[PDB]
Amino acid sequence: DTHILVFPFPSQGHINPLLQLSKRLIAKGIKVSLVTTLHVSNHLQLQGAYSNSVKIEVISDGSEDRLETDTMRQTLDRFRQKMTKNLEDFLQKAMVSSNPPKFILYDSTMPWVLEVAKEFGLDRAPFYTQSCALNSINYHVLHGQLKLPPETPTISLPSMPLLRPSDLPAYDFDPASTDTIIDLLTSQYSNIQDANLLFCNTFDKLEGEIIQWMETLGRPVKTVGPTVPSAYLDKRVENDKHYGNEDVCLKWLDSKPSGSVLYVSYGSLVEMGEEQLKELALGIKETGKFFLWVVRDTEAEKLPPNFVESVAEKGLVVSWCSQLEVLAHPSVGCFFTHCGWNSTLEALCLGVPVVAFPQWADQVTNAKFLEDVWKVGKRVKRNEQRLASKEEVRSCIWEVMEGERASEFKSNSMEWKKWAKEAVDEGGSSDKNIEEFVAMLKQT
Template sequence: MESKKPNHVVVMAFPFGTHAVPLFNLVLRLAIQAPTLTFSFFSTSKSNQSVFGSTSNTNNIPRNIKPYDVDDGVPKGFTPKHPMDVFNFFIESMAENFTNRIRSVYGGGDEMKMMMIKCFIIDTFMYFGSDMADQLGVPLISFWTAGPSSLSTHYYTDLIRQTITLGPNGIDGREDELIDFVPGLSPLIRTSDLSEGVLFGFMELEFTHVKHKMGLALPRAAAVTMNCFPELDQPVLEDFKSKFQKCLTLGPLALTSHEYPSHTHDDPHGCLTWLEKQKKTSVAYISFGSVTTPPPDELAALAEGLEESGMPFLWSLKDHAVGQLPNGFLERTSRRGFVVPWTPQQQVLGHDAVGAFVTHCGWNSVMESITAGVPMICRPFYGDQRLNCRMVSDVWGIGTRIKDGVFTKYGMMECLDMIFSEEKFRAKVGTLRGFAKHAVGPEGSSTKNFKTLAKIVCDGC
């Protein structure tokens, strides 16, 4: 009897930060394109609940996407004292837990059921997926949720470590040394812009080893995909094309995901209604993503700068941090300021009242700001945020960084004045916005690359 063709695609999401949602949106497009395939979406229970929502909210999700929960690695009965505890437990056990869960879904010891799998789509952090795909002889798609330059620093980690020999004090005194020897990377990138674990910070943590391993695994993927477009980082992407089997830019995802049924939040706090009452490009929008909150002294300095500037502002600030604002700040600024715990960021940035984005420089936020044509004021904190900030301020010239890397009252006022008074920032980000729109158009690079990706995933189905 003839065996059935493989018709399952295994998706492995990284369940922290904003990694899972972009991957889900990509899978959503593929699931609509290939209704005869089943996309098995593996992530932790908490992440899946966030992505898929409650059962009542899944009506718009195609039936050929199936979520499966994976153990997060936290020992039963353990009470985390810090968010990093959960993260570290997950990292140390993710390869074993994902492998075991996938095998349990596909029959455990029944290798014939494993043969139902025709492709793997993984967050790039899930490097061990390369081994599973190799064992089954099926293609693997690696999806990088950040920017090309940050991926380059992980791919070339060994070269960077071999070229920059550090002393006992690490990069102390060498923070401004240029990384001008990595193929394609902007010569303006400095050692201090690198993510922790490349040259400094947490060198012995398991996550540092994970990032190194993922860099080494990239050439094994049938395609490395990312949320960007060529004009953002052409030299790095050209280098990738010579190193990877395929390098496919698919972004900005913010311009493609809205075409498909997806999990979209409404505007529970009335942000868009409030923006309707403001003048065009007059509002400073402040948000530091779902994870980061500046320290109390910086929150106070940021608030003082906003107050003295007289600028209208919309601030997405978690409830627990509101108490750290200066006494009377909310009352004194109530006529021109709006502080809420959550905003529909993509819609907010797209509103013509917003004239500047004060951001931590997470990649999704940077891409959404470019897509909306809004210049940025950058205060990065960790990971790829520092490198993204360097690209925004020094390479693309579409924003500025906070002086000395921390919020001060007068530093904030200076940045606001610069962004709102100098048209060069708005002009440059407007140019990139045009490239972004073309990329997702009928003849654009992202549209063509998605068709290439869909052919890899759907080949033979």
């Protein structure tokens, strides 16, 4: 029996892509052991009931956990030192056992895993869970052709679309952490010469030339995305309808005409100012369109006093909906999104045009691609003070849903939905790369 280790960065948020991929290759006959922390274990559903259910391997005791007193660097140092030792102790046992793992697939944000696998002679590959475009940016910042402060007004990287400085990832939200975050992202490409493969959460038709550029770094690149549940695409893997509730959103959507509703989500981790949140709320109201806005309790409290009351007819403002179920609903014609890589891929897979309102990090670069490269929507015009007016919000929504290019966006959205599904369906670019990896694993 062939089994591998999957070791994603242990944070609630980014372990889903690796789990989604795990489902693909559990279906192709590969057993998977999830390597994770005590903490993740407690907040994760306990081990499945089947023979080929993902096996949970807790290798830490909790002392790696970040402290309230820590700087990000200090948190990262303690995490690396302790988890290095933990992995070493784990493989010391696992490698000399009757069925030793054949591979370790680890999040690219933990490059020190490769050095541990190298010691044990264990086949290994990083997994880049963000866009291939970000791989190009972070690589070029590592090698010095791009600086943390852009040195020019237009950035023209090989095989990339032209980028303004405003299109580049902005990690200066916490200036204290900015240096540490840039170091972490650039260190993802330092030791790739010893990686068996480089896995990427994307597909060939979405970033084909960028992927071809990455292949010139000397290693086999395997595009295996998008990691959205099969049920919303090729529908070939049993269940796989969610990542890793009683819904009202679906009934409310059922009464609305096809393609008429704006789904609003500016991210489940993004905080927003009362000022900007007021302009956004009023801007959505001014369009006069049916809208479903999912915003969490702490964010929902910062809305204008009578806002929810005032949109009793057109607006459904709720604490939570199944984003995948809402996007797949035929009444939803447009998605106001913060352009997180997961939201971005979900919009493309479900063939829904976007009103892009990026906030931080890779969202800025994802927005650029959605508007100028994939052409499935528009970015809300910002101010000189980075504040979007309710008029800028209203016009952007109208232009995407009712403007000159409205039909272009939906047509392009349906094309990407087709191509995303084709990539993960039998014989697709992603399915082929996954079959190759599986075949390689059965060769030992």
